[PDB]
Amino acid sequence: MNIFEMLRIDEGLRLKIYKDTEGYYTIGIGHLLTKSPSLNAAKSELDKAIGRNTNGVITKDEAEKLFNQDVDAAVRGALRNAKLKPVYDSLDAVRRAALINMVFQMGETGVAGFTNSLRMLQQKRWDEAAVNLAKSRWYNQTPNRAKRVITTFRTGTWDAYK
Ligand SMILES: [Cl-]
Numbered sequence: 502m503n504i505f506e507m508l509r510i511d512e513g514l515r516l517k518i519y520k521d522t523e524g525y526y527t528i529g530i531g532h533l534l535t536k537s538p539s540l541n542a543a544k545s546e547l548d549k550a551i552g553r554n555t556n557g558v559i560t561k562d563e564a565e566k567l568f569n570q571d572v573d574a575a576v577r578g579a580l581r582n583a584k585l586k587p588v589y590d591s592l593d594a595v596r597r598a599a600l601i602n603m604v605f606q607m608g609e610t611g612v613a614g615f616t617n618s619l620r621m622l623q624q625k626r627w628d629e630a631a632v633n634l635a636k637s638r639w640y641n642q643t644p645n646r647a648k649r650v651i652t653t654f655r656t657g658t659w660d661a662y663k
Contacts, residue, residue, distance in 0.1 A: 502659040504572060504598045508605060510662060511646050514564060518543055518557040522643060528557075529564035531605070532571060575601050578609035585613060588623045596622075599653040606646075607639065622654065631655045 512531030518540070521527045526534045526543035534546040540557075548555050551563055579589045579601055589600055600622075603612050613619075615637070621630035631651050634640065640647040652661040 502662055504576075504601055505568070507598060507602060507659075507662055508568075508572060511602065511606075511649065514561075516559055516561065516564060518547065528559065528567075530568040530571075532564075532567045571605065572601070575605040578604050582609045582613050584616075584619065585609065588619050591623050591625075593657055595657050595659065596654055599650050602650050602653075627655050627657075 509530060514530050515528065518526060518528050518534070521531070521533065525536050526540070526546075528534060528547060532550075534543045534550070537543070544555070544557050547557065547559070550567065551559060579585050579597075585600075585604075589597060592600065600612070615634070618630050618633045621633055631654060634651050634654065635647070637647075640651075649661040653659070
């Protein structure tokens with residue numbers, strides 16, 4: 502298992518524009534387009550992203566190209582953010598993947614906000630960070646996915662994704 506596969510499980514794949522769990526315009530493998538309610542704007546963000554007149558449909562290849570760039574940016578947000586780097590650097594390989602998952606999903610900024618949880622991870626205090634992580638809107642809105650990320654952090658294995 503790896504970051505791509507993991508993320509592919511959590512996000513799915515859709516070749517036509519769709520609304521995410523929060524009602525925002527998305528496409529591909531969890532590629533958010535816009536937070537605006539206009540389908541127009543979304544179409545526009547898409548065309549711009551793809552470099553072509555898409556009509557709200559893309560190919561598999563295109564989906565994957567966006568996914569790649571997305572995973573690459575999330576990694577980099579992990580290394581780049583000042584609250585993040587240190588935690589990231591203290592983690593094992595699996596757990597790093599758990600962190601990136603979160604960055605992809607909620608932005609660098611969303612994650613940098615889970616202060617207490619971040620310190621606990623950094624301290625390698627697994628059971629506590631897991632409880633703490635669970636007291637969140639994140640957890641309450643998307644409980645199954647959150648559970649997955651959470652066990653990953655708890656255990657440091659891929660069991661939740663098997
Ligand atoms: Cl883009």
